[PDB]
Each structure stands twice: as structure tokens, then as C-alpha cells.
Amino acid sequence: IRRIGLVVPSSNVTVETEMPALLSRHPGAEFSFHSTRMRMHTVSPEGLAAMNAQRERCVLEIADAAPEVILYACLVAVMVGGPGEHHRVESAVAEQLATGGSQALVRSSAGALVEGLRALDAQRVALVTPYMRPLAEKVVAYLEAEGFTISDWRALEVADNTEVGCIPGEQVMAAARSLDLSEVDALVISCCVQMPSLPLVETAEREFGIPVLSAATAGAYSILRSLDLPVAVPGAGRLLRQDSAV
Amino acid sequence: GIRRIGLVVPSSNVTVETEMPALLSRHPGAEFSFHSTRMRMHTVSPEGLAAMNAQRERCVLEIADAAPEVILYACLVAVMVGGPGEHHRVESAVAEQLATGGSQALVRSSAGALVEGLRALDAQRVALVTPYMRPLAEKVVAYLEAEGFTISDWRALEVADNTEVGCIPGEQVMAAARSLDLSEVDALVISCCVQMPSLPLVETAEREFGIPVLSAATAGAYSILRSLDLPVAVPGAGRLLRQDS
């Protein structure tokens, strides 16, 4: 049993749901999940700001559980900091654990997404997101700093975090179908930790004929690579079954 | 046996072609050949920089022709002036040019190799020496900050002529090192520029400062080795270049 530490916005309900679910289809490894929450309700530069300020407390709480990896699941709070903020966040967290002899590895949803995209050899990218436009635009800037080209994106503009957790798959699929994907390497069908997408990932891949992924499947990828386990997890798109194919 | 390295250099750049073979012919397990094409530039300003960069595609066909095993785009400041993550885009563009027309040569840029080498060292807190004008020096800093490094101090020698840069004494570079505070620093980038001479200074720097030092040239040397899947074991220049021994 591998203990995974989750740092999540208090109103987030989708990471604690999707991570266990797909990681339970792993061929030989078994996992357990352990959360600490940072208070946020409205996804705004101010909502993000007050949340992010709680990190120090959360890291301390979750390290008490001695997990093998900690996933800092606050994706948009990282990216609103702009170019390479996931490095300085992951670093800050590592530094903090180093103060107390924790052995935990660190990954973030922002890092993982970059990792999944690079694992795909993706250059041209499209994304679907529930954010307001100004925020959607920040996610896009951040990705372009990582070398990707955002050809097309969609922002459903749903600011209340609770409501984001309730976006139906059909709203998400429709936005995805409105996209021009002809010149696109990968579709990030959920660029948000909160917006559900899991039951969609595999089907979208089949329909669109290009790799599909989300913050969650990419988190699951990062996690698996960090614990040296086979990425051979079925039904969550090609990203997650790289070692079954090569 | 002999591994064909490609160099795409600024026309007035002199150091890359001196240092890259200097250190790389010090490998006990492989020998190398160097070959280049030139993008004209005389003034290291946003103007000349852009007009140099516009020459990339011609340069890259020219060198493909020789069929290098790796093509080093040899510009650092010319890459970093174009914004966070520019090296990815430039490498991608070159790479795509090559495949479009046969060549399988691997692609690396100094800017890239710099980060790769900082990262292989496990550096977070970095100090640096540059020849540049401050406005470009700050751009190089911003670029490295977006790559997740903390630039805790830097010197900027402020020498706009690329020829002046190359004629740059070890009196000056070594002096700047000693200038910077390094009591929190993990790695020295003793020269951020592929034009500014640094090498004789470098292996000593480490033994002097107790810390991993490097430069674009050495960092590009490291990156080349890794790309060619050769052991990194090159003398006289930092653990970075001798970390497999």
C-alpha cells in the first residue's frame, strides 16, 4: 500500500474522487489517500490568493501522515503565479519538509500536466477549462512558457468551485467538439482539478483520434512515474497505458 | 567512431569553436568533429539579435548537409530574449526543419543545455556572470526564473560588441565571481554567454568556492554527451562534466 498525500482546495471534491478511481485499476499496486484542505470557494485571483497562503499549515498536516508522495492538487492557484511557479511551489514544499525529516516526494497538478504533455511528445495543444476568461488566459500563458502552443481553448466561465464540480460530461464534451483539433497533438479535456472528466477521457480519445488527458490522469501519471510503477492502467487514455504499448 | 557535432553560431562568435572542442577532445572514450554555419550578427542588441535569428532556417539546411549527430543551436542570449520557454520553441522549429528534410540529428540549444545542466546538478539557488547589457542581463535572469531557479545575485559586464566580449580577460570574469555573495548559492554560472571566454577559470572555481561551477559552453558539453549517450567524464571542468566516474 502506497500512501499518497493530497493537498486540495477545501471545496474540491473531484481529485479525492478521480485519483482513487483510476489508480484502483492499476495492475499490481494498491493505494491509499490522505487529504489536507485549504479553504477556497470562488475561483478568483483573490480566492486563489487566500487559499495559497495556507500551504505552510497543510504541508505540516499531511507530512504527519508520512506519505510516499504529496500531490499539491491546487492547479489554478499555481498557474495564476505565472511562468514556472510550480517549480517554486514544489520547491517551497520540499524545503519545508526538509525542515522536519519527511521523506515524501512532491508533485503538483501543474507540474504533472506539463509531464503528461511531454510524455505524449505534445507540442500543439488544445484545452477545455471551466475557468473565467482572465483565468483561462493565465493557464494559457503558463503553458506557452513551458514550450507548448495553445492552438485553441474554451473557458466555460463557471466561477463557483462547487458548481464546477457539477459540470456534466456532455457540457464538457460539447466544448471539446467545438474545438478545431486538426493540427493538435493532445487535448486536455479537463485543465481543472475540480471539473469532472474521467468517464470521458477514454471515449474522447476514441472519437478525436488524438491523445486526451486531464489534470487528474496526468497527476496519476506523475504519481506512478515517481514511485517507479508501470504505467499500465487501462481505460484512462494512452497516457496511462504507455508501458502496455511499449 | 568520430561523432559529428553541428554548430549554428553567430558569425562573430569565436569562443564556442574554441572551448567546445577544447573540453570535448578531453574525453577518453570518444572523439569528436565540429562543423558550423554562421548567422551574421555584430551587435548583441534586440535589433541584431532578431536579424540573426531570422537566418536560422538557411543555417540549418546548410548544416543538415554535413549530417551532424547533434546540432547545437549556440545562442544563449539570442534565445532568452524571446521570452520564457523560447528554447523549446526554437529547438522544436529546428527539429521540424531537419525531419522535413532527412536529417536525424538531435537538437540542443545553449539556453537549453544551461537549464539541463543546472538541473543535473540539483541547483535551485543560482548565481551568474554575464557580459551583457543589463536590460538583456535581466531578461536572462527572468528566463531562468521561469525555469524555476532563484537568481540570488548576478553581475553584468555591459559590453555590447560581440567582438569586445570574446576579447574578455579572465581578470574580469574571475573578479565578478568573487564579487557575488555565494553563501546560499548551489551553483555558479561563471559565464552565461557562449561568446565570453570562461574555461581556464572553471575547474579551479569549484575547488576555490566549494560549489559546482559551470558555463553555457560546459553545460552544452554536458548536454551533448548526454544526447550522444556517452558517459559524462571530461577532465578539468567540474563534477557536472565528470559525474560518471
Ligand SMILES: [Ca+2]
Ligand atoms: Ca520548463
